[PDB]
């Protein structure tokens, strides 16, 4: 199959509900697109037409973002 174009994406290992405004609640299985990073343990993406931040201790990064520079090494 020809998808066309694909970028960095992550998979949720469990379910997480938003506690504070903005929070981006995910669901075990739902792939959360990756756009940018605000925190050192949080990420940013688009899900259900909503732009919010989500924890990394719940999802796994399959494709390392294109971002370049200093990083855990």
CATH number at residue 56: 2.30.30.40
Can you tell me the distance from the alpha carbon of 42 to that of 1, in angstroms, rounded to the nearest whole number?
32
Please, what is the Cα angle at 25 between 22 and 30, to 5 degrees? 135
Can you tell me the distance from the alpha carbon of 4 to that of 63, in angstroms, rounded to the nearest whole number?
17
Query: Experimentally, how was this structure solved?
Result: NMR
Please, what is the Cα angle at 39 between 9 and 10, to 5 degrees? 15
Number of domains the chain contains: 1
Which domain covers residue 43, as residue numbers? 1-73
| Long-range contacts, 8-12 (Cβ 8 Å, 24+) | 8/34, 8/61, 8/62, 8/63, 8/64, 8/65, 8/66, 9/33, 9/34, 9/62, 9/63, 10/34, 10/43, 10/59, 10/60, 10/61, 10/62, 11/59, 11/60, 11/62, 12/58, 12/59
Note whether 9 and 31 are within 8 A (CB). Answer: yes
């Amino acid at each position: 199959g020809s998808s066309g174009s694909s970028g960095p994406c992550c998979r949720a290992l469990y379910d997480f509900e938003p506690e504070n405004e903005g929070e981006l609640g995910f669901k075990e299985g739902d792939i959360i697109t990756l756009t940018n990073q605000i925190d050192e343990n949080w990420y940013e993406g688009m899900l259900h037409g909503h732009s919010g931040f989500f924890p990394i201790n719940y999802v796994e990064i399959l494709v390392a973002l294109p971002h370049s520079g200093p990083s855990s090494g």
